[PDB]
Amino acid sequence: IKEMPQPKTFGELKNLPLLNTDKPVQALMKIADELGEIFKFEAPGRVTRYLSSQRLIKEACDESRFDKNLSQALKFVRDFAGDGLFTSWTHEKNWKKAHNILLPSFSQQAMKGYHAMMVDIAVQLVQKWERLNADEHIEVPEDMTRLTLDTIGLCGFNYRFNSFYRDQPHPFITSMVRALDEAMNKLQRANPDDPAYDENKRQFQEDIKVMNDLVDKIIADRKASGEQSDDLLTHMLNGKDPETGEPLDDENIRYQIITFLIAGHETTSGLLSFALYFLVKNPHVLQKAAEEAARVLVDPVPSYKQVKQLKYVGMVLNEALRLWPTAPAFSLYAKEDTVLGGEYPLEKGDELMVLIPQLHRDKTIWGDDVEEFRPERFENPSAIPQHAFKPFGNGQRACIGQQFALHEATLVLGMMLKHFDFEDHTNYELDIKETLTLKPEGFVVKAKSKKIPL
Numbered sequence: 001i002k003e004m005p006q007p008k009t010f011g012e013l014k015n016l017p018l019l020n021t022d023k024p025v026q027a028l029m030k031i032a033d034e035l036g037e038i039f040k041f042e043a044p045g046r047v048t049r050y051l052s053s054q055r056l057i058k059e060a061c062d063e064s065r066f067d068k069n070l071s072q073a074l075k076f077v078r079d080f081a082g083d084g085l086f087t088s089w090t091h092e093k094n095w096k097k098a099h100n101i102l103l104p105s106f107s108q109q110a111m112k113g114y115h116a117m118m119v120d121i122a123v124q125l126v127q128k129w130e131r132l133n134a135d136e137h138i139e140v141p142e143d144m145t146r147l148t149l150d151t152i153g154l155c156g157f158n159y160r161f162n163s164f165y166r167d168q169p170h171p172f173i174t175s176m177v178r179a180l181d182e183a184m185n186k187l188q189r190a191n192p193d194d195p196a197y198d199e200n201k202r203q204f205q206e207d208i209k210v211m212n213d214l215v216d217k218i219i220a221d222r223k224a225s226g227e228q229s230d231d232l233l234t235h236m237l238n239g240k241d242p243e244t245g246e247p248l249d250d251e252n253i254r255y256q257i258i259t260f261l262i263a264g265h266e267t268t269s270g271l272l273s274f275a276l277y278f279l280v281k282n283p284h285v286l287q288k289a290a291e292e293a294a295r296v297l298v299d300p301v302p303s304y305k306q307v308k309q310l311k312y313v314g315m316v317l318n319e320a321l322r323l324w325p326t327a328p329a330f331s332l333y334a335k336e337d338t339v340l341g342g343e344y345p346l347e348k349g350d351e352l353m354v355l356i357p358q359l360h361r362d363k364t365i366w367g368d369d370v371e372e373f374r375p376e377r378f379e380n381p382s383a384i385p386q387h388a389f390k391p392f393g394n395g396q397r398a399c400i401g402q403q404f405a406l407h408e409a410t411l412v413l414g415m416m417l418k419h420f421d422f423e424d425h426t427n428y429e430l431d432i433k434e435t436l437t438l439k440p441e442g443f444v445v446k447a448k449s450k451k452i453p454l
């Protein structure tokens with residue numbers, strides 16, 4: 001039975017002012033490097049424990065002992081994502097109901113149906129880059145976000161955001177980004193009810209109303225048209241939970257669509273951005289990935305079956321998820337009193353945070369080369385210890401979008417590697433911006449066409 005270390009305190013504010021930073025996950029990573037596999041983090045009225053080692057996280061991932069917790073960030077996101085899958089408690093009726101209805105929409109089999117829409121958007125990205133002038137560069141996270149937002153719009157509800165036609169965001173996305181920014185800004189606020197935050201509160205209620213009004217109108221328009229497009233909205237309007245025999249109600253469908261738009265804007269775009277960063281920083285790896293793309297993608301338009309054969313590209317994506325998992329933390333609570341690692345007693349209801357980027361740097365798992373980008377680490381999943389690699393979370397509350405994200409990212413990265421050579425023309429210095437997720441801010445490259453027709 002050991003006493004847990006704790007980072008520096010600020011009197012009555014305890015550890016809260018350590019979150020007064022634009023890069024809180026990276027700050028928590030530095031604290032984990034100093035204090036080790038577990039540390040206590042206290043704010044007024046709140047205690048959590050940050051876990052960094054596979055030794056402790058493999059126990060945290062036991063669903064008999066721990067369930068998903070809503071962190072303070074997720075409680076703030078729940079003000080607009082409601083009881084959608086990501087912001088619901090496992091015990092709320094609408095979690096298992098929506099999970100049972102939506103699982104078939106998110107399977108490998110479903111990806112065969114989404115593939116044509118994903119190719120539509122991927123071809124728009126390749127055409128944009130083919131059309132750049134010699135003196136121009138690519139803004140990588142900006143273009144990857146155009147692609148992933150457009151993909152979830154088309155697969156989600158047959159809507160074209162037309163992100164490659166504009167600089168100005170869609171009014172929904174203006175409100176969503178500003179609401180996500182307010183939810184994250186709220187975390188550090190010592191005096192949230194100070195009148196200096198009244199305008200923030202007013203703008204937040206306005207942004208919630210915009211997102212609700214626009215998505216409610218999408219649902220109403222679809223019910224009115226009667227059209228049966230093969231998209232998530234059709235599946236939710238027609239689907240019945242096998243257990244209850246009930247469909248989702250229109251309010252819950254709105255929360256699911258808001259949730260999918262957050263995910264499609266925030267997550268896969270970061271994965272693609274980090275993958276291209278690591279490829280241009282590791283030219284021998286880029287060469288091996290480019291050779292696979294050329295060997296496999298023998299048709300002007302990739303097929304579903306061809307994407308499944310981009311094995312090394314899949315390993316490149318896993319190794320980018322290892323070093324910079326774009327959804328970098330999840331939260332758990334103890335279902336009953338239990339002892340963690342034979343050393344740390346917990347009481348029922350006690351909270352844990354899993355710091356995924358630290359788990360992924362555990363040298364006892366990956367060896368001394370842990371900071372190196374080596375996709376070959378993923379050649380044999382049976383050679384990777386249990387619960388060593390958790391970029392999509394854990395158990396029944398793992399990412400429902402995992403197959404969707406990896407299909408889109410594999411397709412797009414395969415097509416990028418087939419069609420272009422890349423240059424890190426600025427010798428870009430990694431600068432990681434934090435929202436709900438991680439992205440490489442200011443990452444730019446030049447692309448030289450291999451002049452292969454679509």
Ligand code: HEM
Pocket residue numbers: 068085086087099152259260263264267268271325326327329330331390391392393394396397398399400401402404405
């Ligand atoms: C690289 C891309 C992505 C990553 C790294 C990622 C990561 C995660 C993680 C770590 C969780 C667990 C959260 C927690 O325990 O609190 C999660 C849950 C979830 N993700 Fe993703 N995600 C990605 C893409 C997507 C996409 C594309 C969608 C949907 C279009 C999506 C929808 C969801 C949903 C709905 C949940 C909640 C599942 C549930 O509890 O039933 N994600 N994701």
Ligand SMILES: O=C(O)[C@H](Cc1ccccc1)NC(=O)[C@@H]1CCCN1C(=O)OCc1ccccc1
Pocket residue numbers: 019024025041042043046048071072073074187327328329330331353436437
């Ligand atoms: O939101 C939290 O509770 C904690 C930070 C905190 C705040 C107040 C007291 C004590 C701790 N959040 C986090 O540690 C991380 C880092 C910043 C945001 N965050 C988080 O979990 O965001 C939600 C999220 C993102 C991705 C996947 C699941 C959930």
Ligand SMILES: [NH3+]C1CCCCC1
Pocket residue numbers: 086262263266267327399401436437
């Ligand atoms: N995919 C989930 C985790 C990251 C934020 C969006 C929902």
